[PDB]
């Protein structure tokens, strides 16, 4: 029809890891790969709800460029570590966490105070390291809910350090369009999407959420075999009684089975001489067939 378009039929999913996935969709109409891929990439990057660390406060640190004693990493190193922390929040739109650690060793996300609503995706995520024994680290972490990426430079009391907010679960998404064809049409698209998330959600769920958002944005405008002779029975050949009896004793019921048999094998068949073989060759030649024919996978489950 005129309003009928192609739909994907070969949806392939390759799970590189628990957070890395590769999806393939084909066939698509010419040019729709770029449309769908660009729309999905824009939605997954720019507008995607999530939760992220917004700002931090360290008791012993009052300036962004300060030197902490007893902690191996710098202040901006700790900010980088906190920027990569993935947190699920179910209760509200703003939570406050407290981290307190003492001793020597790697201070990680398992040291964050536990809460029912707040869930840490990776407890082993390293926050910093404590070198000396007589040093303790205490910090207060604010987590909020939003969309996409908000730099701290766009948000410019005391001791409040701003962190770039990455609410979107998507860490990376790329798409590529290749050539594909149905039997007749040759200029068709094949869309490949490689995407990695931050562990909060699966890549497939992220793609589904992006597609759902885009679809809901449009709700105000959308209106609702082998050649047939090979399959014939050997009875179609006007063979003699003895030749037919020998063929049935050899469990040959179809023309393909007969034409796959060489003359040497039939010569050694019991109760089969040379006259019967010549008659078989004659009746096959009357239909343009021989005995030295090869077939790839003959019996078609029928």
């Amino acid at each position: 029809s005129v309003t009928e378009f192609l739909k994907p039929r070969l949806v392939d999913i390759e799970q590189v890891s628990s957070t890395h996935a590769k999806v393939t969709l084909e066939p698509l109409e010419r040019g729709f790969g770029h449309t769908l891929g660009n729309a999905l990439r824009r939605i997954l990057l720019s507008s995607m709800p999530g939760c992220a660390v917004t700002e931090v406060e360290i008791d012993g640190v009052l300036h962004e460029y300060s030197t902490k004693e007893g902690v191996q990493e710098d202040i901006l190193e700790i900010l980088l570590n906190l920027k990569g922390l993935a947190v699920r929040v179910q209760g509200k739109d703003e939570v406050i966490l407290t981290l307190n650690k003492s001793g020597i060793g790697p201070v990680t996300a398992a040291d964050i105070t536990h809460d029912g609503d707040v869930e840490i995706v990776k407890p082993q995520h390293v926050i910093c390291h404590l070198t000396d024994e007589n040093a303790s680290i205490s910090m207060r972490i604010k987590v909020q809910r939003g969309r996409g990426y908000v730099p701290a430079s766009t948000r410019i009391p005391i001791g409040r350090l701003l962190v770039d907010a990455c609410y979107s679960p998507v860490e990376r998404i790329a798409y590529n369009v290749e050539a594909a064809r149905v039997e007749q049409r040759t200029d068709l698209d094949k869309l490949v999407i490689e995407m990695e998330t931050n562990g909060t959600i699966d890549p497939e769920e992220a793609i589904r959420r992006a597609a759902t958002i885009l679809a809901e944005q449009l709700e105000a405008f959308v209106d609702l075999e082998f050649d047939p002779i090979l399959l014939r029975p050997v009875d179609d050949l006007e063979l003699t009684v003895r030749s037919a009896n020998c063929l049935k004793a050899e469990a040959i019921h179809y023309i393909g089975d007969l034409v796959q048999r060489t003359e040497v094998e039939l010569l050694k068949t019991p109760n089969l001489g040379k006259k019967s073989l010549t008659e078989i060759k004659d009746v096959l030649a009357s239909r343009g067939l021989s005995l030295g024919m090869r077939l790839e996978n003959w019996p078609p489950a029928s």
């Binding site: 006259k275 010549t278 008659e279 060759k281 004659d282 030649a285 009357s286 239909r287 343009g288």
Partner: peptide
Amino acid sequence: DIDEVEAVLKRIQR
């Protein structure tokens, strides 16, 4: 014999 010649001729005629 003549039967083999006849069969080959039948094959060729096709």
